[PDB]
């Protein structure tokens, strides 16, 4: 039967009960020991309230805001007898501020995104740079520098960001092994970074194809998705963003860097969900992905940076999302950008509404001796239904990653603010793998120059197929 | 009961029996008197053969080619008694060569496209300019100059090109009435061009939204459309192309003109089916269309050109396609361009497969005192099934236009080579309108600058919303 990993000795406060909350709650109940009355869910939605009442869980129907979060969360997280756990799966709330509050009060914390308080994403007085995930991530890095160590808080530990950081480490180990390179696997950041450099990894796509289909066709003027519509549109409207490799020799005219921070990122002055890149997955083969900004695009490139004695970067991989969402979400983006405004309505596909499909989610390492290697999960909706309730394949990859992060935080409770790249990737994947369906590594000889140039002139670099110049759809 | 317009006493030679041929044959049998035995269908496919045999129509299973078309077609065209009619609804055949052969033998001719002999659309030695619909149309204009008058041959008389020319004339008439512009209805090309100028029509979109949906979801690696997949992909991979208005102040860097010809066009060094434009239809409201090359983009702009004494163009409207095909076709394009190659299979949706939807097809006249005016057909699949067999709503708009052109040609059989713009639009709409469902004119305050600029800097022209600079998706 199911492993019980740990006792939680205090309140469990779940903030948000949308698609990921609904998928995560049963895993928390499944895999942790605690008094049922210790758990409470906070969400402003009536829909969420009715579901929570049906599950028999405590529910507080309230939006967490800048104005009320201290008054609301501090008593709940410190109810005792010991250390509680704040599980933040919301939108419109500040990850940074709630995280800092949890840490001040000795409660563990996990989220799946660096979310700002409501109002941030569409503030007209904000420059595009300030709306970037690079900038949000830097607030977390600064918080860590200001308060090193202390109670563990896990930032951005979903499927992506989150799990895919663990896939990158496993992929690097697999590439090395497949070359006949034997020896101790890296243990430090510097060793991982040098492994990527030594293997000649030029860059990484977070290469995803969602093939989940609904029993009903896409309705006119309804945005459809397999996870948060609000969250997807939000990130989709942020600037296109990528971790920027040292091998790159070209960037578009509307690309910009950053004055400060870890130094690993650029962004484009255009929305990521209307930016296309040429990419590849085992089931899709060659496909367009959208260049949607993601925390791990920066965090992985940062993690895998090799610096010289002077502190200058001598190696860093390119890293970015290449997202092909479900067909109805592709159509939803076409409708939204085509109308110049958000649809009147939206819906997230429930498992009962999905006829078939998978969420194929992995990391595509390219530029090395075997050209390209994809490593990740091919979780189907059929398998999902067999092993976890109240979610689709997309949800389960995320909720199981939150599970793994919670297990790691409980096992390593004095580690301070950490990213998915900081966790024991083997332990996390050990906890998560029961919920990931097939997990496979696949080589391909495909490159962004396959079939090019065609019948029109193209600005391409034939000496280096994986240059962003060739990947970006222009 | 249905009107029988004329008796056809000679052979009726239908070249091609795909989606449009299948929809047109029943209309021909319905609306003309002739012995069924004088009908002959020529198509290389087994599928076409089985369908023709089921209809009891003579069938020749041959591909018409540059090598055989004279030997194959001349005896069919001249079998008598009296004048034959060549109804050309094929792919991979030269419209020009077959047209000249019909004329040389005294047979009437109609088609729905200026198609080249097989090999042209992907000939690697052709310059982009030579692959343009402008260049193909010039071969027809040259033929007309070379042999003025003579037997009627109707070039490009489907739904679009074809019907939309008649919609432009009716729209201009409606606009004049609404804008209070006085004068007699134009009766010459020169008078039409002057009316468009006097109304201040800056440009015209062929503004289409197809909402037909199938009872099955789009299959992976299958291109799905409501009409010719081969024909759609061929034109989609031709350069983006537009009739170019005198009001335009900007063209993109990869835009090019023509050294010779009528002078009304430009093209872009990129495929039209992967080129988006901001447009509008009554059912879609604001939407993306694809800037797919079309004969009427050039023919309508050329037709509405006003010249001074020197022969210099002083007024010309912009004119181009702004096509939003059915959702499964939108997905098919994303798949094809994302993979960089055609799908391994394709299918055209049958009326028996379509669960609902319309083919909303009209002309959007803009820049005048009432901003924009859309005029056209909103034909539904439900209505289509009630009034015509063996076709969906897209098919019926095309087949009924072919019917109209055939009636016109019989009533005007010595008019020489003509385009849809040369036909009497009232007579043609009188024949076609019973098959068009609701035909409506709608005004809108929408412009391409609606909601712009937004979150990111945009290269827009704020002085004139309808500039191509604002329409083209960059
Ligand atoms: N790392 C990853 O892989 C990953 C994957 C999916 C989702 N996410 C993130 O997880 C979060 C949730 O995703 P989802 O699919 O569950 O979203 P969702 O849209 O389905 O649900 C969001 C929930 O948050 C609630 N909410 C809104 N304002 C709130 C407030 N002030 N306080 C508390 N709750 C509030 C809503 O009522 C809703 O029920 C999002 O922020 C999303 O970006 C991360
Ligand atoms: N103006 C318009 O509005 C409009 C609209 C639709 C279609 N069209 C055009 O009309 C034509 C037909 O469209 P469709 O939907 O019927 O196409 P389709 O693909 O369904 O059918 C094309 C037919 O042509 C046949 N064919 C191929 N090679 C041939 C040859 N060498 N000789 C004779 N026949 C041959 C095929 O076997 C097939 O049955 C296409 O060229 C298309 O572009 C125009």
Numbering used by the authors:
A (entry chain A), B (entry chain B): 3 to 476
Provide the authors' original text about this structure.
In contrast to its eukaryotic counterparts, bacterial HSS synthesizes 1 mol HSP from 2 mol PUT. NAD+ serves as a non-covalently bound prosthetic group for BvHSS. The interface area of the dimer was calculated as approximately 1700 Å2 by PDBsum indicating a stable dimer23. The BvHSS subunit consists of two domains as determined by CATH24: one “NAD(P)-binding Rossmann-like” domain (domain 1, residues 3–163 and 394–425) and one “homospermidine-synthase-like domain” (domain 2, residues 164–395 and 426–477) as shown in Fig. 2a and S1. The crystal structures of BvHSS containing NAD+ clearly show that the active site is localized inside each subunit.
The pocket is a “boot-shaped” cavity that is approximately 21 Å deep. The entry to the pocket is formed by part of the “track-and-trace” loop (residues Phe-122 to Asp-125) and the α-helix J at the protein surface. The active site is situated between residues Asn-162, Trp-229, Glu-237, His-296, and the nicotine amide ring of NAD+ at the narrow end of the pocket. Residues Val-115, Val-116, Tyr-123, Asn-135, Leu-138, Pro-163, Gln-240, Thr-295, and Asn-297 form a side pocket at the “heel” of the “boot-shaped” binding pocket, which is filled with six ordered water molecules of which five occur in a nearly planar and equidistant five-membered ring. At least five amino acids (Val-93, Glu-117, Tyr-123, Gly-233, and Ser-236) form a pore at the binding pocket entrance. Narrowing might occur by the bending of the “track-and-trace” loop resulting in a slight rotation of the side chain of Tyr-123 deeper into the pocket and towards Glu-117, accompanied by a side chain rotation of Ser-236 towards the pocket entrance. Thus, the ellipsoid-shaped pore is narrowed from an approximately 4.0 Å times 5.0 Å opening to an approximately 3.3 Å times 3.5 Å opening. Slightly different relative orientations of subunit A to subunit B were observed for all BvHSS structures.
